[PDB]
Amino acid sequence: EMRISRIILXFLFLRKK
Secondary structure, eight states, rough: OOSSSSTTTTTTTTOOO
């Protein structure tokens, strides 16, 4: 598990939203 392959989502939609 990585949060640098999820923050990378966790900053994606996290951007979008």
